[model samples]
Target: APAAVDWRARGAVTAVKDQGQCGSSWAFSAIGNVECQWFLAGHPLTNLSEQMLVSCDKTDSGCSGGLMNNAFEWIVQENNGAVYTEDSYPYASGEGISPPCTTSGHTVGATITGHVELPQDEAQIAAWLAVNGPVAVAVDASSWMTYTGGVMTSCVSEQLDHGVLLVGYNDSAAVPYWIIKNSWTTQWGEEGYIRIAKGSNQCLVKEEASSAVVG
Candidate 1:
């Protein structure tokens, strides 16, 4: 973690999304990572399909809930196919309904060669984001529903129930924190983002961190 890092400001991150009333945050998290990695890997920033994973990746619950790690596995191993684009496979299930998996017309918008898990250390995670693109991670986002701005001072738990993207970090602030990208829409947090305290294991931000390998 040199002094700080902001990948979004570097033209890697994609637009923020809204997961609606679905617990398919895991899909959004993985999609955000894939988009950023593809862009940073010298490709155009394309909107990958979270709906494809939500409907096809059955290793975990489609829309009810899932693990970003498994989504990466599905992308690189299980599915082993090109990730669908937003226009190809639009988000069909938002009201917590598990739509039947569509196995046809799957367009290849972007592809991830593989994925790597980040260490549980804050410094290492920061360094990874600095070099690579945004990372898909799970954190205890139970209280993030009401988060509007400022550094999140509460809601620190290791029981990570929601997945998000780690976009950047601000170590220069009086209280060092991490910039997180959420899928709860821009109406939620600071234009669909939040900053959580860093180095304190707040919300287990470093746990279950994964990034896709794009080429």
Candidate 2:
């Protein structure tokens, strides 16, 4: 742990379990990122629907999944912005049709504060993360139908393999751990989340979080 850096808690983050059944990890992650941002902004927890990200967002975020960079880019394009929530943008994963504007509201919140990408270098990621907010990340977790905790030695390799969320990180011990969330149901792992090995060639994220759409 950095001697002087203080960790910030964004409160309880709800998991949109079982997106894997539809290969909609990207959708779950995109919405999860927004929910974390909202919590940091000191607002009541809002259950944003992954449906918008899965359907409306013009990207490859389907059963095939997608990159964090795509999510950030989408948000930036929305401009003054909007974040679609449950009522307006309910989730059906890849099970049903999700047309654009299917779940929209006239009133909305602020545009995204910003988005970031994780670097391949572990030190670089730990450095930037020390002062940043919850970042949307990609990691390989295919075998992780229900993972709990471990260290990450190669995030990119994992990403090259599967898609998951890197919620936060902690270096309190000699071996730092990256906090991750999955959509494989709550019974799996540590309540649907995983702690992977940190440092070295561990899970690295795409260079950008470019898909964000504000309602």
On TM-score, the leading prediction is 1
For model 2, what is the C-alpha lDDT against the true structure? 0.57
For model 1, how does the per-residue alpha-carbon lDDT over 48-145 read when each residue is reduced to its tens digit?
88899988898978867899988888888887747889988999777777678876787788877788898999888888888776888899977776
Cα deviation at 79, candidate 2, in Å, is 7.2
lDDT of 2 by residue, 110-189 (tens): 35645655555655665665545445666555445434445545334534545566566777766767666777776777
Cα misplacement distance, residue 179 of candidate 2 (Å): 1.0
Against the true structure, what is each candidate's TM-score? 0.95, 0.75
Q: Which ten residues in a row have the lowest lDDT in candidate 1?
A: 95-104
Runs in model 2 lying further than 4 Å from the true structure? 1-12, 78-80, 94-110, 146-159, 204-215
User: By how many angstroms RMSD does model 1 differ from the true structure?
Assistant: 1.3
The CA lDDT of each predicted structure is 0.85, 0.57
Q: Largest lDDT belongs to which candidate? A: 1
What's the C-alpha lDDT at position 93 in model 1?
79
Model 2, C-alpha of 89: deviation from truth (Å): 1.8
